[PDB]
Amino acid sequence: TPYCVADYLLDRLTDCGADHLFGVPGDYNLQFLDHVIDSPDICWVGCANELNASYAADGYARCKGFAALLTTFGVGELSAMNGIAGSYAEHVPVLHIVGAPGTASQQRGELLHHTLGDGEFRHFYHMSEPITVAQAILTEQNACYEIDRVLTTMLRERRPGYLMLPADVAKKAATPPVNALTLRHAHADSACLKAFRDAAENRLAMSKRTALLADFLVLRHGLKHALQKWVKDVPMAHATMLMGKGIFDERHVGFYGTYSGSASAGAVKEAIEGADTVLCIGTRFTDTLTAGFTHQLTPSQTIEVQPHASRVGDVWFTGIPMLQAIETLVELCKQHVHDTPPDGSLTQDNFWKTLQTFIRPGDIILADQGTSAFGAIDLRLPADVNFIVQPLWGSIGYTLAAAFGAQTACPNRRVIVLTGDGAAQLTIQELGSMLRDKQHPIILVLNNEGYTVERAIHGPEQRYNDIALWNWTQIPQALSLDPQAQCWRVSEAEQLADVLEKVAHHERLSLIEVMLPKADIPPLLGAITKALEARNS
Amino acid sequence: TPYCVADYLLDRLTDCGADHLFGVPGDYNLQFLDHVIDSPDICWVGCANELNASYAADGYARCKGFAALLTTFGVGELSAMNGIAGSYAEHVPVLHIVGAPGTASQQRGELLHHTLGDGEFRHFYHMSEPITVAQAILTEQNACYEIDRVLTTMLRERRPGYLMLPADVAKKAATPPVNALTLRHAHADSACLKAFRDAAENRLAMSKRTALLADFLVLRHGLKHALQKWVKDVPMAHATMLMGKGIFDERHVGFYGTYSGSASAGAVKEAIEGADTVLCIGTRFTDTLTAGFTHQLTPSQTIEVQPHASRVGDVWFTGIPMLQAIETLVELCKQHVHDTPVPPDGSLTQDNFWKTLQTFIRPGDIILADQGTSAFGAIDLRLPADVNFIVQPLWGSIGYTLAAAFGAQTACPNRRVIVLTGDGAAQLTIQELGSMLRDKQHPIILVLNNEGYTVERAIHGPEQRYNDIALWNWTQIPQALSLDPQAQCWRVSEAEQLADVLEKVAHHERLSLIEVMLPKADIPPLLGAITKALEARNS
Numbered sequence A: 001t002p003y004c005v006a007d008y009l010l011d012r013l014t015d016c017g018a019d020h021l022f023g024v025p026g027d028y029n030l031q032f033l034d035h036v037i038d039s040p041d042i043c044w045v046g047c048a049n050e051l052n053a054s055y056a057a058d059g060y061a062r063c064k065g066f067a068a069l070l071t072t073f074g075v076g077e078l079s080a081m082n083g084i085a086g087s088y089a090e091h092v093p094v095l096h097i098v099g100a101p102g103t104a105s106q107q108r109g110e111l112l113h114h115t116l117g118d119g120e121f122r123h124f125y126h127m128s129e130p131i132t133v134a135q136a137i138l139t140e141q142n143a144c145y146e147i148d149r150v151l152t153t154m155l156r157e158r159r160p161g162y163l164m165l166p167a168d169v170a171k172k173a174a175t176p177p178v179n180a181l182t183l184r185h186a187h188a189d190s191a192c193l194k195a196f197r198d199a200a201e202n203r204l205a206m207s208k209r210t211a212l213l214a215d216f217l218v219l220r221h222g223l224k225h226a227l228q229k230w231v232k233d234v235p236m237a238h239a240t241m242l243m244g245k246g247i248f249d250e251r252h253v254g255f256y257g258t259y260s261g262s263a264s265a266g267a268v269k270e271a272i273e274g275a276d277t278v279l280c281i282g283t284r285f286t287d288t289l290t291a292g293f294t295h296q297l298t299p300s301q302t303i304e305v306q307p308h309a310s311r312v313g314d315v316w317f318t319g320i321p322m323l324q325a326i327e328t329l330v331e332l333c334k335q336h337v338h339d340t341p342p343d344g345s346l347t348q349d350n351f352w353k354t355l356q357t358f359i360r361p362g363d364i365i366l367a368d369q370g371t372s373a374f375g376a377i378d379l380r381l382p383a384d385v386n387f388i389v390q391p392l393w394g395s396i397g398y399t400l401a402a403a404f405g406a407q408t409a410c411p412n413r414r415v416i417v418l419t420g421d422g423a424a425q426l427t428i429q430e431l432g433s434m435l436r437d438k439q440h441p442i443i444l445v446l447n448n449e450g451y452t453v454e455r456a457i458h459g460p461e462q463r464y465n466d467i468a469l470w471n472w473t474q475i476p477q478a479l480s481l482d483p484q485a486q487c488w489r490v491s492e493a494e495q496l497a498d499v500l501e502k503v504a505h506h507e508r509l510s511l512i513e514v515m516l517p518k519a520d521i522p523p524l525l526g527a528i529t530k531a532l533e534a535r536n537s
Numbered sequence B: 001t002p003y004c005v006a007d008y009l010l011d012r013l014t015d016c017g018a019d020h021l022f023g024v025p026g027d028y029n030l031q032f033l034d035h036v037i038d039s040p041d042i043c044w045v046g047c048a049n050e051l052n053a054s055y056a057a058d059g060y061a062r063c064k065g066f067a068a069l070l071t072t073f074g075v076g077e078l079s080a081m082n083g084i085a086g087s088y089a090e091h092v093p094v095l096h097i098v099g100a101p102g103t104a105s106q107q108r109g110e111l112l113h114h115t116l117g118d119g120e121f122r123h124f125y126h127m128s129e130p131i132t133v134a135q136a137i138l139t140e141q142n143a144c145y146e147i148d149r150v151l152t153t154m155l156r157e158r159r160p161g162y163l164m165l166p167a168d169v170a171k172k173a174a175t176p177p178v179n180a181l182t183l184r185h186a187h188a189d190s191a192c193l194k195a196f197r198d199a200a201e202n203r204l205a206m207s208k209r210t211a212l213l214a215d216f217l218v219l220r221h222g223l224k225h226a227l228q229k230w231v232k233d234v235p236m237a238h239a240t241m242l243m244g245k246g247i248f249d250e251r252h253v254g255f256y257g258t259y260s261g262s263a264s265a266g267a268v269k270e271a272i273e274g275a276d277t278v279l280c281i282g283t284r285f286t287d288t289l290t291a292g293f294t295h296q297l298t299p300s301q302t303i304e305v306q307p308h309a310s311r312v313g314d315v316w317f318t319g320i321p322m323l324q325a326i327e328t329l330v331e332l333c334k335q336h337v338h339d340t341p342v343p344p345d346g347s348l349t350q351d352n353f354w355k356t357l358q359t360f361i362r363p364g365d366i367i368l369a370d371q372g373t374s375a376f377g378a379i380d381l382r383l384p385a386d387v388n389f390i391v392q393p394l395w396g397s398i399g400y401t402l403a404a405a406f407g408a409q410t411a412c413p414n415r416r417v418i419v420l421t422g423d424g425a426a427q428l429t430i431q432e433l434g435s436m437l438r439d440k441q442h443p444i445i446l447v448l449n450n451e452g453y454t455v456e457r458a459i460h461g462p463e464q465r466y467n468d469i470a471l472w473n474w475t476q477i478p479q480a481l482s483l484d485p486q487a488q489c490w491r492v493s494e495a496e497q498l499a500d501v502l503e504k505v506a507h508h509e510r511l512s513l514i515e516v517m518l519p520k521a522d523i524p525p526l527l528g529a530i531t532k533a534l535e536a537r538n539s
Ligand SMILES: Cc1ncc(C[n+]2csc(CCOP(=O)(O)OP(=O)(O)O)c2C)c(N)n1
Pocket: A368, A369, A370, A371, A372, A394, A395, A396, A397, A419, A420, A421, A422, A423, A424, A446, A448, A450, A451, A452, A453, A454, B024, B025, B026, B027, B072, B075, B076, B079
């Protein structure tokens, strides 16, 4: 087993923080897979299909900062395309490795399985170009520096990359590197830095009250601790939006709730929108995050920091790393910013209140699109919570499979899965992977007997919002010969509270089927369901 | 409810042969969905996910000649891409309708859900371009003629098309067409047809024994009955390959078995490879179909017919419709081809499994088999008359079969559907079993359970953990995916038990799921030839 390109790729992957590889085998990637199996540094995680694997890698990367997916040419990689696209949309660095037919076969234009039957082998590489920041077709002549380039760009942009690995290229000789792959820390030109620093300083110097609004780009670029220490050293009103929830301990002084535009609690609206200066850090004002773009924040009111550029009022300063922009603003703030800030029947209301008493520091909480995410936005999170939600891409089914990737990343943390009954149908077979791997998530299936969110938007009585009605508490014993799962169906707040006490220490996988009313929607959902379909009558 | 673009599209769908629409709802397609529900001609079929929906539409199109898929912008269409890709690879005309944000929203570049967050709304349209023969972004100014163009091109090529339907465009006023959309039959220039006819005749006039090899393009372009009539009116040696199985009644004189290159039965090799002229009709000699390109057929030995061009020896004749090429060859064969073709154990094995199933299949059956030890065992089934045999060996996506079966049963509620899937394959699309049960379908699902990924076990790393899977409780799945399953499940390990169960479910009064327990390292005959010349490649 002489060291080869397959080994070099695995060495560089682990350098980037991935200790696991998700995917599904196929004949074009089997020989590469042998190197994954034999490696002591990377653990193969076989998934039940490729879409789920790409969701799982995404959740993993939201826990470890990096992840990798392996599929086979054509059928595998195209099955995962929606996963990689969602990682691109939400800035999740997932590496898609595609095992491919050998280069000689490709050059001869053979009529191989997993092709369109036209002798062409680059169609799927090109279709992946819009949803990655870097891609390469690996050859014997470029392998090691193309691997390094794509991984490096992935680290810089915190977004997916793609590598086509022909089976023969994987076996070509390589050399172990002495140094791990690192992304050299960027620094703005000092005159550029001064221009931004001066404009921010002069703006902040005239602020009576300043507020801090941070979101998901802070998470992706590893700046959570910097944002927490900032508000600790400089107390002020602060918030996140739905995507970046979990950046802050929401019990801390100065936090009043998650900002969601006009749907915000009044205290949040006043704390953020009422400040005469609002620092917008790693923020993206999407339609869901702002209740249909009804946020009230003007350019002259705001300072914003993006990964490579920052803005003060009307002026953009480009080529400033977000790390340096934040550091600049922390020092400047230090220089001013002074004066500190049980029922019966289950409803959406008492469910989220019951869940509120249950969550604890260390929890990993995932919520899918639908009433799950828009109820969970109102959870007041304690310290050290990883809150994983996908409101920009918005692919239902993401959450159950992402939970499998997240638990793989963090076996000793408690994983709470909040999924609608409709969402869980799209990726149910990854429940079988959790049981196979002896994971102990707490899966809460919000069963309101259909697509309730779509009922809110349009056609509440229309049969297209109906689904097959599953027997949720029997699924683990169908997807395992020895599930060792604890299942309950609950319809009362007291039953849910009692069950939550029983599963608090997650010694087994648990599935809680939560019986909820069909037309019941959380507060934010009612607010977001007033201008959603406003475009078309 | 004035007639609008949404209604015009649905009317054109019916014209093309589709009576159902598969997919998953989303806020960007909901108002269009209201027109699907209200339509008396199109029945909405909600699916458990978009990948499965696209597989189901594919199976439906292989029964009805056309199918349609509805997804939502971004998250929906990208989940279905592998299905549309397989429909393109295997020439299945599935129409992908993508409900999209309204045009003004797109023009403003808003940060909308199901986008990449860049204000760009044409990324996914562009990514679908390689896997469709036609696509359009529908506007108020082009809607009805772009709809007709894309559907017409799909009918001519028998391949997928794509339409992005912004929500506002769908409500724009339209007019019901008086005439159905039709694919006018193309005609070769008569001098061009003559050139092919003369060359084919000169070859056939000197051929001592001529054989006929027809495959899947015959099925896609509606020429099954023509090929059956050809071999009835002109007896001669004939075969298909795996993809085209079902073109012929395989009990009829002159049929000796399915051709698969060096893995063929000796009678087939002699009948096909031993002929001095082999008419190759709608054929694609893929690696799977030829046991690793070990077929022995030379250019001067062959005449081939593709959808728009035909070849005699080394010379190609282009701009000839496959239909007219076939009509020409039928005439020439009637002139020059004057032949009379020479005409239960205990424990379950691969061999006695297929022998048991052989006695069970009947005319009218729809038989679907997935990649693995299913399709390559099913290749040896001797099909009676009027069987629809659905296999996907060129694209080769496992999981396709269970979801395609749901589409096939939807198309043909009164036909018996037999699903041959491995335990590994069924895991990728299992949630569509729930759709089968919801809709009270009665397929016969045989899960070939040998406790892992046997097909790759054979090719590489048989003891490697990546060929293992989670072990499911197959006979409990219907009761998990339904509150009241109209199902019966059995687990069988003996040939006689399988025979007894199959006899019980012959009239398919309920969904039946049969977990068939097979040995871990047991592979069918044809795979043994395909497993040696597969790791003969990239190693
Ligand atoms: C992959 C994908 N397909 C379709 C949609 C459209 N969609 C948005 S919400 C929804 C229904 C979600 O239902 P469920 O999980 O039961 O949620 P709830 O009833 O709590 O709203 C659908 C189909 C989507 N977001 N993602």
